[PDB]
Amino acid sequence: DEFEMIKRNTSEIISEEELREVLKKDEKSAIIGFEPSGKIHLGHYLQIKKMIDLQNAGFDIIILLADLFAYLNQKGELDEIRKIGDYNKKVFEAMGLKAKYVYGSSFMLDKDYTLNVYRLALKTTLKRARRSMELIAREDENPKVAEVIYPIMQVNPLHYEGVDVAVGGMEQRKIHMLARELLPKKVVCIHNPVLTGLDGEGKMSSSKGNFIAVDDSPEEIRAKIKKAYCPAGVVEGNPIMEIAKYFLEYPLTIKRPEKFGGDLTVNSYEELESLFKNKELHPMDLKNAVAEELIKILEPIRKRLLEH
Ligand SMILES: N[C@@H](Cc1ccc(CC(F)(F)F)cc1)C(=O)O
């Protein structure tokens, strides 16, 4: 099913009935926005993989390099942000994405864009804007006015003209709930889960420095994975298991020494999860398998980012 391919590994689709209608049409487009990021990590790639799914299913793909948004979220000066955006777009092309790339600031300063922001600032409460940003806003002991403008710009109808589907992480869902209420035409949201960071502390993050970057060296992936929170028998909160779920190909053959049980062949992640949960498979053989298949999945991307 095209539908079930798109739905595989998302946390929610709002809504499924509207997505079946979109899939019927001959012309459909899907958008995702990203604040430019100094490092692109597996959190980014999970979402790019969803966009490749939509692209296989017939959708035109639009990537918004959300530079002004990064600007409001205190990531720096704009033309410095627009140069990080340029690099991120190289990375997304090396992931195998066939898309159109738009810089926010190329249209977000237009008079009609600006008037919608003022119009929406009239319908949106300070309390709701702030709630909507709890998972997104840069850490700040004295919150700035910029924090409450960010979500109203994210739900501006100009971002969604001729767009059927928006894709984002679950950390964006309150902002999308706002847009569901306030947008003139309905857009389907597809939310992808948030990856746990390597120490299990919170969520994977370019500023928490708890991530694996797609351009990481092999030795580097090994060392991050070796150090990673992965309690025996525990799946919930375990970032090594998450990587197994969202990134690996099954059936999976796990090489191990014959004293640890010999080569193991798992035909599904659900099979891996039962093996792991009852301790027929130890963190260390998991880790070696995950590290080794992660290296092979990332290699072509590291290669073209390094080509020259
Ligand atoms: N909040 C996102 C960035 C963002 C996501 C979505 C949009 C609207 C749209 F998706 F681009 F159309 C604008 C910016 C993030 O946290 O990177």
Query: What separation in Å is there between the alpha carbon of 135 and the centre of ligand 1?
Result: 13
Tokens encoding 288: 């070696």
Name residue 71's amino acid. Answer: Y
Residues contacting ligand 1 via CB (< 6 Å): 31-35, 64, 66, 69, 136, 154, 159, 166, 168, 172
Query: What separation in Å is there between the alpha carbon of 32 and the centre of ligand 1?
Result: 6
Q: How was this structure determined?
A: X-ray
Pairing of the two strands 188-192 and 165-169: parallel
Tokens encoding 48: 């790019």
Pairing of the two strands 29-34 and 12-14: unpaired
CA-to-CA separations, 69 to 103, 121, 128, 141, in angstroms, rounded? 11, 16, 18, 20
Query: What separation in Å is there between the alpha carbon of 242 and the centre of ligand 1?
Result: 24
Burial 3-23 (b: 16+ CB within 10 A, else e): eeebbeebeebbeeebbeebb
All domains of the chain, ordered by start, with CATH?
1-195 (3.40.50.620), 196-308 (1.10.240.10)
Which residues fall within 8 angstroms of residue 236, CB to CB, at 6 or more apart?
none
Query: What separation in Å is there between the alpha carbon of 155 and the centre of ligand 1?
Result: 9
Mutational pocket test of ligand 1: of 46, 100, 172, the residue with most ligand atoms within 8 Å of the beta carbon:
172
CA-to-CA separations, 276 to 7, 15, 100, 127, 245, in angstroms, rounded? 25, 34, 41, 43, 13
Q: What angle do CA 29, 84, 91 make, to 5 degrees?
A: 55
Question: Hey, whose CA ends up nearest to atom 8 of ligand 1?
Answer: 154
Query: What does the DSSP assignment read for the chain?
Result: -HHHHHHTT-SEEETHHHHHHHHHSS--EEEEEE---SS-BHHHHHHHHHHHHHHHTT-EEEEEE-HHHHHHTT---HHHHHHHHHHHHHHHHHTT---EEEEGGGTTTSHHHHHHHHHHHTTS-HHHHHHHTTTTSPP-SS--THHHHHHHHHT-GGGGTT--EEEEEGGGHHHHHHHHHH-SS--EEEEEPPPBPTTSSSB--TTTT-S-BTT--HHHHHHHHHHS---TT--TT-HHHHHHHHH--SSEEE---GGGTS-EEESSHHHHHHHHHTTSS-HHHHHHHHHHHHHHHHHHHHHHHH--
Tokens encoding 27: 């012309």
CA atoms lying within 13 Å on the CB side of residue 288? 12
What is the resolution of the experimental data for this entry, in Å?
2.2
